[PDB]
Design a protein around this nucleic acid. Structure first.
Ligand SMILES: [Mg+2]
Ligand SMILES: [Mg+2]
Ligand SMILES: [Mg+2]
Ligand SMILES: [Mg+2]
Ligand SMILES: [Mg+2]
Ligand SMILES: [Mg+2]
Ligand SMILES: [Mg+2]
Ligand SMILES: [Mg+2]
Ligand SMILES: [Mg+2]
Ligand SMILES: [Mg+2]
Ligand SMILES: [Mg+2]
Ligand SMILES: [Mg+2]
Ligand SMILES: [Mg+2]
Ligand SMILES: [Mg+2]
Ligand SMILES: [Mg+2]
Ligand SMILES: [Mg+2]
Ligand SMILES: [Mg+2]
Ligand SMILES: [Mg+2]
Ligand SMILES: [Mg+2]
Ligand SMILES: [Mg+2]
Ligand SMILES: [Mg+2]
Ligand SMILES: [Mg+2]
Ligand SMILES: [Mg+2]
Lengths: 184, 67, 60, 144
RNA sequence: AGGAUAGUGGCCUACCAUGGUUUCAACGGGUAACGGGGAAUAAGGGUUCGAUUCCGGAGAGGGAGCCUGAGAAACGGCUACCACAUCCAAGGAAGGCAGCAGGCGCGCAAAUUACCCAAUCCUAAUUCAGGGAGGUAGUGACAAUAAAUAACGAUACAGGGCCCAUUCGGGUCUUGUAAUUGGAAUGAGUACAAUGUAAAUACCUUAACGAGGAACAAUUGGAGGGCAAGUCUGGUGCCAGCAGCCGCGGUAAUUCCAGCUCCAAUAGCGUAUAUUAAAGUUGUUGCAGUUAAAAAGCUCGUAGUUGAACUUUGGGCCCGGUUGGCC
RNA sequence: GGACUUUUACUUUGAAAAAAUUAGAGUGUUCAAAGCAGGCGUAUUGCUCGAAUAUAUUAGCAUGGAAUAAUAGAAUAGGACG
């Protein structure tokens, strides 16, 4: 006996497994954004479906309804924060009309790619997994990170890593040691 | 790193309020050596079967093993 | 219906087939790399777009 | 008026009418009469262990000429006799006799599958060794 | 009316009366039925599940009875009977794991005979002792979360523009292809340490070691249609076998056994059973009933369902709220 | 405080409907599932925001409305006012 931990799954498999159009779109997204799984796209579609369900439940109501005002302004703020929704679009209909790519463009992987530092989304993914960036001066090794539009300026290489400095690295040290012992 | 810290006004206060495992970590006190838990329990249950101190039936079994 | 028969021929073809061992190939990439490979093989490379963008066609 | 009563105090009629017309279904009837627990050589279970008695060369239904390499199985919990199909090329040669096999259904909810008349189950294991594995030569069968 | 009870009361007794429930489903039977909070799936309505972390109830192998106490019809408390069964120097004695571990069986089907009271809390004469309650670790692919298995160049090819617009001369820049080759990066995994902890183990940190492929090598299913992806090769030849359904196989198999290639999901994938959606194939929303299944042979009629219209309307006068609107 | 006082159904509002779960607000678990944390200073002595809200049938409770649908009233006047 103890209070149970709560858990939820974050993705939903599509009903039709083999739909060439959907497969093509999914693989195009995966190639454009450097993904290993359709599960990532399913997860983003799941989040977007929840957001859209909420927005529909609110839009069915009256405007000046306190629940609508409160929760809709909160949703809009929470999306404008991550930049999934522009500050030009704050009317709760563009929320419904957003996209999957609007979310998928805010991942730290493609955001690294945009802010130089990787010259490829796959290079960015491996750089993240290999600890060679810091969002503030905090290290992250997760591509799915959803930058908040204020950390975008603070993204940079990590101090305790090569490309930020203070040590070359394992293979470089081995090569320099081979070179130095050969110098003898 | 982030942790919690306490600083007492004296050492007797610390030795009366802090736990013994933490005083042992700091080397102020010594961890009293203890028999294992199920060993203590077995001993308690063996004693539960004895009424009194034990000397009477001790000398009695000493006498009666010759019988 | 008849439940009996002749159980002698069990495994006929599986036994008759000449065994052919797999050719050792370079390992394929696994994960994000394989998705990159597929994206290239399909979209930026139009490798086989005869009429209908076939994927595993026959040599002709 | 489309038959059914529409009145605002006519819900009991609708309820009991539904009960009867639900008995007209198949799944509801099987679920409530308890046919699985009372019949259906398993006990409404997914799988069942049994002892092999005999190997069989059941002939296929038409149009199809073939022999399907089944076995007779006495179930341990019920004692019921059951015909089961050994699915693969040559896998009857791992089921010699007096084996303790595990049976599953085939997938048709108790019906018979294809050109195989009268069998509703398939063998999944012999002595706990996974016919698939034995056929792909991943594992070998015990001595006894 | 009395007795009994802590108290009400047919709870029990004496006397008396003849009542009480029932097609608005009594009573009886079944439940693979503890009930709820809730769970799965759900456009909406709904269907199914709910032994199981909380609440209530019941039980301690089956029955019954009872001591003690504020409180038990108590079972890690007694008494007896039944059934199981232990030790005996056969006279007798002692038993209750549906508490924690663990073991036989049952089976499709489920973990260590481990450490500790440091935390949460409880009991006690009580800060101090105890607590298999509880926590800690071990087994653990029940389910869930995040997420490695490679990344970037320089050379050898095949593109598209722009400078020369001097034959086919150079090519600057480009997107892919390689029995090309380079140096970088990294963690899985070892491990001084420290942290962590009741003490350990792990996590998070971190010296030193720890990638170049014949290594640190990702499977699971499938390629006729439904339903992503072969009319390629070899073998068999209504045989073996595949195939949820339709179907394949009878000497040129796109379906079997294999090789190659390809496709789908991917540290997960498949199979079985059950259930939900699909299913407007349960139909309140929302089925159908001439011929496809289905209008009783016809009328009357009691439980029910449904049931024509009509009774204060219209007009005015004020007050102050919410939206707006120049400003 | 009293004389009294037609009876319902219906609907509004409110209270009530344990917590966990559900939806949902805020917030560093490095993201996320989660959790209910945490954040800010001269960090020498300290200051401070929170841990919301909604849903929760039917039955019962109170409350406004009084259309819709039932119910009753003064007819051999033992009728109302006074
Ligand atoms: Mg009506
Ligand atoms: Mg046929
Ligand atoms: Mg009385
Ligand atoms: Mg009486
Ligand atoms: Mg039961
Ligand atoms: Mg049960
Ligand atoms: Mg009890
Ligand atoms: Mg028992
Ligand atoms: Mg008892
Ligand atoms: Mg016990
Ligand atoms: Mg046990
Ligand atoms: Mg394969
Ligand atoms: Mg196959
Ligand atoms: Mg196709
Ligand atoms: Mg096929
Ligand atoms: Mg093949
Ligand atoms: Mg529907
Ligand atoms: Mg129909
Ligand atoms: Mg006819
Ligand atoms: Mg007909
Ligand atoms: Mg007629
Ligand atoms: Mg009526
Ligand atoms: Mg009422």
């Amino acid at each position: 006996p103890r209070a149970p931990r709560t858990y939820s799954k974050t993705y939903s498999t599509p009903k039709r497994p083999y739909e060439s159009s959907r497969l093509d779109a999914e693989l195009k997204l995966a190639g454009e954004f450097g993904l290993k799984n359709k599960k990532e796209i399913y997860r983003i579609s799941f989040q977007l479906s929840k957001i859209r369900r909420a927005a529909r439940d609110l839009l069915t109501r009256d405007e000046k309804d306190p629940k609508r005002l409160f929760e809709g302004n909160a949703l809009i703020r929470r999306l404008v924060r991550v930049g999934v929704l522009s500050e030009d679009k704050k009317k709760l209909d563009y929320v419904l009309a957003l996209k999957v790519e609007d979310f998928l463009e805010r991942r730290l992987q493609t955001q690294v790619y945009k802010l130089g530092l990787a010259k490829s989304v796959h290079h960015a993914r491996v750089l993240i997994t290999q600890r060679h960036i810091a969002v503030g001066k905090q290290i992250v090794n997760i591509p799915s990170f959803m930058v908040r539009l204020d950390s975008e300026k603070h993204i940079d290489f990590a101090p305790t890593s090569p490309f930020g400095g203070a040590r070359p690295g394992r293979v470089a040290r081995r090569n320099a040691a081979r070179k130095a012992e050969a110098s003898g | 790193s982030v942790g919690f810290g306490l600083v007492y006004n004296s050492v007797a206060e610390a030795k009366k309020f802090e736990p013994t495992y933490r005083l042992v970590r700091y080397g102020l006190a010594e961890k009293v050596e203890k028999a294992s838990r199920q060993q203590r329990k077995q001993k308690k249950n063996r004693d539960k079967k004895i009424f009194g101190t034990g000397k009477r039936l001790a000398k009695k079994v000493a006498r009666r093993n010759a019988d | 219906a008849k439940v009996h028969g002749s159980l002698a021929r069990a495994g006929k073809v599986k036994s008759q087939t000449p065994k052919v061992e797999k050719t050792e190939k370079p390992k394929k990439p696994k994960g994000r790399a394989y998705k990159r490979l597929l994206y290239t093989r399909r979209f930026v490379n139009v490798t086989l777009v005869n009429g209908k963008r076939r994927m595993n066609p026959g040599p002709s | 008026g489309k038959g059914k009563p529409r009145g605002l105090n006519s819900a009991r009629k609708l309820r009991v009418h539904r009960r009867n017309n639900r008995w007209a279904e198949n799944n509801y009837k099987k679920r409530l009469l308890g046919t699985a627990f009372k019949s259906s050589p398993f006990g409404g279970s997914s799988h069942a262990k049994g002892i092999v008695l005999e190997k069989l060369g059941i002939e296929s239904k038409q149009p199809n000429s073939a022999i399907r390499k089944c076995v007779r199985v006495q179930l341990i919990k019920n004692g019921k006799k059951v015909t089961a199909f050994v699915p693969n090329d040559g896998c009857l040669n791992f089921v010699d006799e007096n084996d303790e096999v595990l049976l599953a259904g085939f997938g048709r909810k108790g019906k018979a599958k294809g050109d195989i008349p009268g069998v509703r189950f398939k063998v999944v294991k012999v002595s706990g060794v996974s016919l698939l594995a034995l056929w792909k030569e991943k594992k070998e069968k015990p001595r006894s």
